[PDB]
Design a protein around this nucleic acid. Structure first.
Ligand SMILES: Nc1ncnc2c1ncn2[C@@H]1O[C@H](C[C@@H](N)CC[C@H](N)C(=O)O)[C@@H](O)[C@H]1O
Length: 251
DNA sequence: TCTAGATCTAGA
DNA sequence: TCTAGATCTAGA
């Protein structure tokens, strides 16, 4: 099992067993919500189309892929004992938000992700990263995970676009895995309309003989959205207990 | 999961 | 010129 080099919300590292068994085979894997890319790092497709709405994330991935050794050496400088304090963190955060250089931003982005509070990724409406200091004892520099990512990235294209645009790139030799933001159990958030729209696009792709796999919480709403797919309940219970749902659209 | 402080939006 | 109610900000 390969780990992502980024802390990221909704990481599918724990559920990789259930995903890979229910994920159809193909020449290309399309991830509209790639995030940290746990599935991409733990599968073996000939090529990938990885997309996300986060421009900083996609920019980082392009840098790591194209300028690997240069990035690792630069990013390694920031993972020293002297940088693990609030005053240094907040200046680096400010440097990140004021930087117009993709490389420097990518370098700082990794630091902020590993030194920031709970590994959060949060922006204000000005597009400024505003996650406070994390106060970790010893942040880990994912050098091994970085090189493995860049190695696998050689067969992947990265795009900063919404799910509708990325799924439109899917061909007949493609498989689509969708990991959208979690549906609510009970602004800027991923809306219920978008949750329903995702299933609708999934219905269109399978009608075009393109396999689509979707993962989400197991709720009454998700069962309604994915009612045209074979439903597979994963028990990772985690005051109520929440199961996960794998919705497969097989042609 | 929170919340004090600042800002937004409408009532013509 | 208010400001209730709802967002937004960011951990200071
Ligand atoms: N409309 C959108 N279109 C495409 N991606 C989005 C959209 N909204 C949110 N996202 C991204 O979808 C991702 C959701 C993550 N939970 C995915 C995690 C990913 N599966 C991983 O293993 O790391 C986030 O990175 C979002 O930035």
């Amino acid at each position: 099992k390969n780990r992502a080099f980024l802390k990221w919300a909704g990481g599918k590292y724990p559920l990789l067993d259930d995903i890979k068994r229910h994920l159809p085979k193909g020449e290309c894997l399309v991830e509209p919500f790639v995030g940290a890319g746990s599935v991409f790092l733990n599968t073996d497709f000939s090529r990938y189309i990885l997309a996300d709405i986060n421009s900083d994330l996609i920019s980082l991935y392009n840098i790591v892929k194209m300028r690997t050794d240069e990035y690792v050496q630069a990013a390694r400088e920031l993972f020293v004992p002297e940088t693990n304090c609030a005053e240094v963190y907040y200046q680096f955060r400010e440097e990140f938000n004021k930087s117009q250089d993709p490389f420097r931003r990518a370098v700082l982005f990794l630091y902020l992700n590993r030194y920031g509070y709970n590994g959060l990724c949060r922006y204000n409406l000005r597009g400024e990263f505003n996650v406070p200091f994390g106060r970790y004892k010893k942040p880990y520099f994912p050098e091994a995970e970085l090189y493995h990512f860049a190695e696998k990235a050689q067969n992947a294209f990265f795009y900063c676009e919404s799910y509708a645009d990325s799924m439109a790139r899917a061909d007949d030799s493609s498989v689509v895995y969708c990991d959208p933001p979690y549906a609510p159990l009970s602004t800027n958030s991923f809306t219920l309309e978008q949750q329903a729209h995702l299933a609708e696009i999934a219905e269109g792709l399978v009608e075009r003989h393109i396999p689509v796999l979707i993962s989400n919480h197991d709720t009454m709403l998700t069962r309604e959205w994915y009612q045209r797919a074979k439903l597979h309940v994963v028990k990772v219970r985690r005051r109520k207990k929440v199961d996960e749902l794998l919705a497969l659209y097989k042609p």
